Each structure stands twice: as C-alpha cells, then as structure tokens.
C-alpha cells in the first residue's frame, strides 16, 4: 500500500487539517520530499500539543492529507 518510488529531488505538498477541542480549525501545508514534508507536518502538530493537548491523526488522500484532532 502507499506505493512510492522515492527521489531526493521530489517535491510534494502535505496538507494538515487541524481540528481543536473547541472545534476551531486551520490548515497548514508542508513542502519537500514526501518523507520530509510528512515529518514537518507531525513536528508542527507536536509544537501545538502544549496549548492544545494530545493529537490524533487519520491519514487520507493516499497520505497527502493528515487530519489531526487535538484533545484539549
Ligand atoms: Zn496502509
Ligand atoms: Zn526513479
Ligand atoms: Zn510503481
Ligand atoms: Zn519520497
Ligand atoms: Zn531522500
Ligand atoms: Zn501556552
């Protein structure tokens, strides 16, 4: 699954749709290799944990979309 031919110079965009405890929202985009952009998206989620609580992710769009919810 998620078949991927990797290339160091590959350019991709990972969309992170965030939903917070009070239901507020925002979308953040990360660019670079699929692996790096993916790593940066989760790193951003981690920075928001202190103020917004633990996060849960549901991957979609074959991995290009990360729907992340914060528990508060
Ligand atoms: Zn799978
Ligand atoms: Zn190739
Ligand atoms: Zn192939
Ligand atoms: Zn790759
Ligand atoms: Zn690489
Ligand atoms: Zn704070």
Span from the CA of 25 to the centroid of ligand 6 (angstroms): 18
Q: What is the largest CA-CA distance in the chain?
A: 40
Lookup: tokens for 47? 């920075």
Report how this structure was experimentally obtained: X-ray
Residue 23, CA distances (Å) to 36, 41, 64 in order: 28, 20, 22
Span from the CA of 46 to the centroid of ligand 6 (angstroms): 13
Lookup: tokens for 10? 């590959």
Give the full edge-to-edge strand order of the sheet including 55-60: 25-32, 12-19, 65-70, 55-60
User: 10 Å Cβ neighbour count for 66?
Assistant: 23
* Dist CA 21 CA 55 (whole Å): 10
In the chain the domains, ranked by start, together with CATH numbers, are 1-72 (3.10.20.10)
């Amino acid at each position: 699954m998620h078949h991927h031919h990797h290339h160091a110079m590959e350019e991709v965009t990972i969309k992170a749709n965030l939903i917070f405890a009070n239901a507020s929202t925002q979308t953040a985009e990360f660019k670079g290799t699929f692996e790096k952009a993916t790593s940066e998206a989760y790193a951003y989620a981690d920075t928001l944990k202190k103020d917004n609580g633990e996060w849960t992710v549901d991957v979609a769009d074959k991995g290009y979309t990360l729907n992340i919810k914060f528990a508060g």
